[PDB]
Amino acid sequence: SVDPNQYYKIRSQAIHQLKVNGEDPYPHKFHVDISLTDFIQKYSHLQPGDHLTDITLKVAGRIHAKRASGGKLIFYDLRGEGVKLQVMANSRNYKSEEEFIHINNKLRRGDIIGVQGNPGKTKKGELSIIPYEITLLSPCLHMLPHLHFGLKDKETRYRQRYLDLILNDFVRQKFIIRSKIITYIRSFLDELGFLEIETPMMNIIPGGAVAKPFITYHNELDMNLYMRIAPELYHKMLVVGGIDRVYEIGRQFRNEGIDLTHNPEFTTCEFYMAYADYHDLMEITEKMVSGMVKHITGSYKVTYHPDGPEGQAYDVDFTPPFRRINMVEELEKALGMKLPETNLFETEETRKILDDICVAKAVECPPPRTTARLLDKLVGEFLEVTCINPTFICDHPQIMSPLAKWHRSKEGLTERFELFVMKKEICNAYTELNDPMRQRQLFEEQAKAKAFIDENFCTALEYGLPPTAGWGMGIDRVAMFLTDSNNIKEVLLFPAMKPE
Amino acid sequence: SVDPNQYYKIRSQAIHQLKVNGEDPYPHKFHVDISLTDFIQKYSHLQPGDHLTDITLKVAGRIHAKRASGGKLIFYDLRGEGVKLQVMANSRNYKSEEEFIHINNKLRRGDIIGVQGNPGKTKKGELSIIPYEITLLSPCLHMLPHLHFGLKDKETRYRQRYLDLILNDFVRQKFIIRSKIITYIRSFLDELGFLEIETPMMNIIPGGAVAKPFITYHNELDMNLYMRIAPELYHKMLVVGGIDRVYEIGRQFRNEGIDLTHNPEFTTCEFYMAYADYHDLMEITEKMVSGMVKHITGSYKVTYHPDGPEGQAYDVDFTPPFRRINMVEELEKALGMKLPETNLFETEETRKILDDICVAKAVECPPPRTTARLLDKLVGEFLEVTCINPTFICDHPQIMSPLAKWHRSKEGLTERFELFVMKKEICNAYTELNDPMRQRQLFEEQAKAKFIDENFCTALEYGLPPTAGWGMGIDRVAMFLTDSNNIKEVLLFPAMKPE
């Protein structure tokens, strides 16, 4: 058999031969009279045997199958826009029989062609176009996988997305879903009077987050810049400036390991809303997420395959209202035991109480075994695994929530929630800090662990930030869950890949 | 008078004392019953003298002016959402007289306060809220500029945008316009069946563009990455994959000088459309841009100040159809002269004809004086300066358009256009190249003048349909539609040379 390299060499020669022969297989243009989708909807009503010799139309697409029948009849499987239309190339209906031979002899599977012909339906009842003229618009120089075998190797799909999209329609449907999600988010927030904003992705200071950053050098400034991890601080500065409702769906950057659940660049949505608290955002999140799912999917009911198409299937019910649980209470109810008072979560006596609880319940916790990390491990093992449907986990302790405002009624807790779906977090929200002295404390304590402080942002707080609530969502993970992908590369058009 | 640092120290102490005194001026929250804008529309019908003791409402905002009248009556100018509402704090109407004294003594200009009170209108006819209780929500610890004097120093405005927004409402309107522009573009393209996509901003190779790049090191990969200059190559790979219409409104990065018209990161919109040429995109561009202007501004007519509010004012008429000019033809018509044949633009004698023409018409052109650069200077001096209204400049010569497909009818020209507004280009479009050998040639020529995207060459070897591309600088469009002669005016947080 021919191998891929020999096929590519032979076909490049043929196309080169077409050029020198005055038949350049890359012509200036091909105006399409109608899309394949319109053609199918406009002419699906025809009866087996029909042929409209009175209507000539120009369509185009890519050849996926070429089946010769008798030598004066050829069938082409023409694909585009996720649909398919048969080209019944019948010599007697072509411009001329000599040209009919000439065009069929040059066309191969994968070629992009333009078809000018008549609508019709075969005797078997297959909607077809009877071509008067076929034009090779762009040839496929490479050998495509066997028809019906397709492209299944994930590494190849992710490194050649164009090939994945040529062969796999479900991949096209995935990225349509992803775009619909972002579009839906903008519609929802725009209708609530939020201003969609653009803030810097390059900053002079890295800031207090533990995340390892991308560093780049600015030659004109003789200075280093750091790629952003979140737009948070710029958004609140705009809230200080009087823009009460702001959101940004943008790229963030993390300089860490690349694998199936980690990409160096990713997409988040953050919004900040003056004079709201986390209960306001909870109601906002419920309506947005439930409405998104029903609008894009058709139902509140969604099935998801955490381990792959052949693995277990989980039914995820987005029917509002979402289940609401308070972290400490449900953790007590799930353990079947009373935990210490919430204002005692900083004493060492409660730390070992929790340490013992992890020992007794075989809950893994690597060092440091702090109260915060032990609680976090216990919650993930007793409360997050339970959250298959969308579930708000609420009122986290302060010792686990440094950035959030304190709870008004309950000592030691904060005004915070996390929305969990399929055991994973999909958005974070809490009432923000607006005391400039408290913000300076947090920046210094973050800096102490690093070894910077955003003095500009501290100054902005000194001018006055109103009470504000913040919200953040990972778009990629939402896209995974709504495209039934157990992998982040499935929802990234061009995922970062560890080089060959 | 007190200087700003002494004011900040005195007010910080006072707020600290409020804390230790159990009246923390940062309370958890303040629920607003109604926005200032809704309040104004709902209660502007009231009569001078009215006071609705039958309605209690909670509003909030920032104090911009505090004028005491007699000691039991104080007026506060409360601002928010770009609007303004007066608080007529009347002691007889407050919760209690001691609390009324206590709250007014702590409030200063700039403080964010919550007001619970009754709608009403004073005898002068000013819509007001009669407070039953005022709450300090966040104090302004810094001295603000004198009322009526505001913030005018551009450098200060750009380094403290929050302060610029506090003091200058026109700045708020500008960035509302900017968001409307991006939103309008998405609306237009989505309705034409375009898929809004996200393509990588980090790549392993810089690519052939002359642009100076940002380089960053990936530790886990032990490799350098380059910040993108355009998403072009990823979009066409998606068109190869069968997604015929794609667009991306995203950030690009250039590592060059920072000044009033240059920022290291900026926003463009690119889209690619299978089976279209530049005439298709010309009609698309006309409808999008004209419709955008009328939708956001209310008219096709826009006024613009290239040199500032006190300088010359230009009327820019976006009424379709836009004027269309063919570069070589109008350059001949404008020069009053016949140029050489369009297929002779590579001979040295045609280069010297043009060199002489620039000498005779005093058109500055620095070396190298190639045919391409001499034409470009002549076009900018004779054809682009005239383009005040939106004007399509079309059919550029091949010698000036390496990325564009060749024109079938006119030898030496390409299938290309540029949309010019106020003498500046705002979008470029042409019929793309899809011959994989030709793209490889272009990549090789780009590489010698310094790389080759082998992956993108392979994708073309699988087959790219005839496709047309389109690109627009959002920032420059935002400038022209917010009457800004400066890029920092349309960037929320512009890059700034270190103090």
UniProtKB/Swiss-Prot annotation, chain B:
Substrate binds at G208, E232, E270, Y272, N428, E432. ATP binds at R254, N255, E256, H262, N263, E425, I426, G473, I474, D475, R476. Phosphorylated on a serine residue after mast cell stimulation with immunoglobulin E (IgE). GO terms for biological process: basophil activation involved in immune response; diadenosine tetraphosphate biosynthetic process; ERK1 and ERK2 cascade; lysyl-tRNA aminoacylation; positive regulation of DNA-templated transcription; positive regulation of inflammatory response to antigenic stimulus; positive regulation of macrophage activation; response to X-ray. The N-terminal domain (1-65) of the cytoplasmic isoform is a functional tRNA-binding domain, is required for nuclear localization, is involved in the interaction with DARS, but has a repulsive role in the binding to EEF1A1. A central domain (208-259) is involved in homodimerization and is required for interaction with HIV-1 GAG and incorporation into virions. The C-terminal domain (452-597) is not required for interaction with AIMP2. Homodimer and tetradimer. Part of the multisynthetase complex (MSC), a multisubunit complex that groups tRNA ligases for Arg (RARS), Asp (DARS), Gln (QARS), Ile (IARS), Leu (LARS), Lys (KARS), Met (MARS) the bifunctional ligase for Glu and Pro (EPRS) and the auxiliary subunits AIMP1/p43, AIMP2/p38 and EEF1E1/p18. Interacts with AIMP2 (via N-terminus) and MITF. Interacts with TARSL2. This is Lysine--tRNA ligase. The gene is KARS1. The chain holds residues 70 to 576 of 597 of the full protein.
